[PDB]
Amino acid sequence: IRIFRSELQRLSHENNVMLEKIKDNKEKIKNNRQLPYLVANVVEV
Amino acid sequence: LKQTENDLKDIEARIKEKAGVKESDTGLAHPLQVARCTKIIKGEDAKYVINLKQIAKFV
Structure with a gap:
């Protein structure tokens, strides 16, 4: 109510x-x- | 009739070629045998953006 309000x-x-x-x-x-996303497939991560 | 249809390219076709081509080709794009769209952002609802060509297929 006193110290807590200072740090809050x-x-x-x-x-x-x-x-x-x-x-x-x-x-x-x-x-x-980009909203028009294109279909793709990741071969290697 | 022959000379009447010759000058229609400068008068009537100017509107026809604008609404029938420029509107269809807008953005690198009635029986429809083909449809194309390139980079169209529309806010899920009426999104479309479908390329009928086998290259660069969309969902």
Whole structure:
């Protein structure tokens, strides 16, 4: 109620730092993937 | 009748060749014996993107 609120604000803000970081990544990871996927088969891993 | 159908390439066929070819060939692409599409992104629902040629088959 006193000390916990001090450290919670730091972890909550750092969670927002990666939130804006993934917000631009979510737009890139979905757009960079080509929707018309082509059928393929991997011969050797 | 002979001279009437000669100049239709500059008048009537300009619209016919645009709607019957340019629209069908848009993006490296009514009885249908052939269909082709290249890199079409449409949001699962009406996706299609099917190449009838044996090369580069799609699902």
